[PDB]
Amino acid sequence: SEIKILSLNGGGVRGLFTITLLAELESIIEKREKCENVKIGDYFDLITGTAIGGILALGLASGKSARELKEAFEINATKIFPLKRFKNKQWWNLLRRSIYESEPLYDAVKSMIGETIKFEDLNRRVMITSVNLSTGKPKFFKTPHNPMFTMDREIRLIDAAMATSAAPTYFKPHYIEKLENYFADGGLVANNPSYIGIREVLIDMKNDFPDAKPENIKVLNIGTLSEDYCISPETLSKNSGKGYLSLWNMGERIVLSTMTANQHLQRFMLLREFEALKIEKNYVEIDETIPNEAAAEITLDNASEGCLKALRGSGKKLAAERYTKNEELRNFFLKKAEPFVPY
């Protein structure tokens, strides 16, 4: 009759906005409905995540409230992105090794989600998009909502969270000993896992949803302050005939353009499809754009207190504003989603 999907983009530190918006939404539901022990993850039949959105997707899927994840986000964000290595993000340090370390990231998820629970212990469906560097193909960690799935049942949620967050430059690739393969972010293939989220319900979650059409699918995509990347007009008009050193500075501009264009495309097919069935209102996207002055400050991995306050303030402001105006946002929390019982 109705299927609700929560999609979280990958934004690193900017995932604080993703969790602050969800945490602020939890308090609004409790205050207005006079209830208690409200978890944002109980209203969604599928929770899709990618990069830092994947880590929050696993936390909500297990059963933790967004406020608890938000509390762990604040203390851990400084440890995950120390200021000693943020200032050393220059050429010869990057040319020698990846910045930061995976151990602070590993410990943060361990307290957040655990170190033993696997996908077969989850009562909520989840997707953790990632790419397999060993084979070159994208590998999507997910709960066995398909009865015939025999691969992701006994991985461990911490392995999926570490795999999708192992940024190609910001972190070392994550080795899963169970799979004997190395992994990287799902943002390389889908920074906005909202289109692929709709696909899974249509073709794979048929045991639970025998008749699933896009009209009965509602998507609540919470962005991470999506940056609209583009090459500067002066560089394009002046350095078009150059190469690498001037245009496409090292590999940076090629991948960032590749990520942004791919991210835009998946959103475009998501948008283009919905107007075809005239059901655009089913897609609720809650995201904004960083102002130019704030854009140079709020980066992917900036843990400074000033920008952390800005991310928290943006999430609190957007959550309250969109709840008042967007009626479709309020419809996600009218009823609790049925728990996922593996077949």
Ligand X SMILES: Nc1nc2c(ncn2[C@@H]2O[C@@H]3COP(=O)(O)O[C@H]4[C@@H](O)[C@H](n5cnc6c(N)ncnc65)O[C@@H]4COP(=O)(O)O[C@H]3[C@H]2O)c(=O)[nH]1
Interface ranges with ligand X (CB under 6 A) = 137-140, 142, 144, 149-152, 196, 199-200, 203-204, 265, 268-269, 272, 320-321, 324-325
DSSP-derived secondary structure letter, 131? E
Which residues contact residue 306 at a Cβ distance below 8 angstroms, ignoring those fewer than 6 apart? 297
**Tokens (6 digits) for 87:** 């200032």
- The CA-atom distances, in angstroms, between 108 and each of 56, 72, 111, 199, 304 are 12, 8, 6, 31, 18
Name the residue nearer to a copy of itself (CB basis): 115 or 327. 327
**Tokens (6 digits) for 133:** 């560097």
Q: Which does 304 bind (CB under 5 to 8 A by kind): a copy of itself, ligand X, none?
A: a copy of itself
Please state whether 248 falls in left (phi above 0), alpha (psi between -120 and 50) or beta: left
| Residues within window 272-311 making contact with a copy of itself, judged by CB under 8 A | 272-273, 275-276, 289-298, 304-307, 309-310
Q: Which does 86 bind (CB under 5 to 8 A by kind): ligand X, a copy of itself, none?
A: none
Q: Which does 144 bind (CB under 5 to 8 A by kind): ligand X, a copy of itself, none?
A: ligand X
**Cα 203 to Cα 212: distance, rounded to the nearest angstrom:** 9
User: Dihedral of CA 231/235/237/241: which sign?
Assistant: negative
Which of 105, 113, 196, 303 binds a copy of itself (CB under 8 A)? It is 196
Name the residue nearer to a copy of itself (CB basis): 6 or 196. 196
Q: Which does 131 bind (CB under 5 to 8 A by kind): ligand X, a copy of itself, none?
A: a copy of itself
Which of 79, 257, 329, 331 binds a copy of itself (CB under 8 A)? It is 257
What minimum distance in Å lies between the beta carbon of 245 and a copy of itself?
5
Q: Which does 236 bind (CB under 5 to 8 A by kind): ligand X, a copy of itself, none?
A: a copy of itself
CB 105 within 8 A of CB 303: no
| Residues within window 31-90 making contact with a copy of itself, judged by CB under 8 A | 31-32
- Span of 46-54, 67-75, 157-165, 254-262 interacting with a copy of itself by CB under 8 A: 254-262
Name the residue nearer to ligand X (CB basis): 265 or 279. 265
Which of 63, 106, 172, 279 binds a copy of itself (CB under 8 A)? It is 172
**Cα 31 to Cα 70: distance, rounded to the nearest angstrom:** 18
Which of 99, 108, 127, 219 binds a copy of itself (CB under 8 A)? It is 99
Name the residue nearer to ligand X (CB basis): 75 or 269. 269
DSSP secondary structure of 55-69:
HHHHHHHHT--HHHH
Name the residue nearer to a copy of itself (CB basis): 84 or 96. 96
DSSP-derived secondary structure letter, 295? H
Which of 87, 137, 210, 211 binds a copy of itself (CB under 8 A)? It is 137
Which of 268, 280, 328, 336 binds a copy of itself (CB under 8 A)? It is 268
Which of 215, 240, 336, 339 binds a copy of itself (CB under 8 A)? It is 240
SS (H, E, C) 304-334: CHHHHHHHHHHHHHHHHHHHHHCHHHHHHHC
What minimum distance in Å lies between the beta carbon of 106 and a copy of itself?
14
**Tokens (6 digits) for 162:** 């570490």
- The CA-atom distances, in angstroms, between 185 and each of 120, 239, 249 are 23, 31, 22
User: Dihedral of CA 102/108/112/116: which sign?
Assistant: positive
Closest CA to 263 of 5, 6, 11, 3: 11
What minimum distance in Å lies between the beta carbon of 245 and ligand X?
29
Q: Which does 180 bind (CB under 5 to 8 A by kind): a copy of itself, ligand X, none?
A: a copy of itself
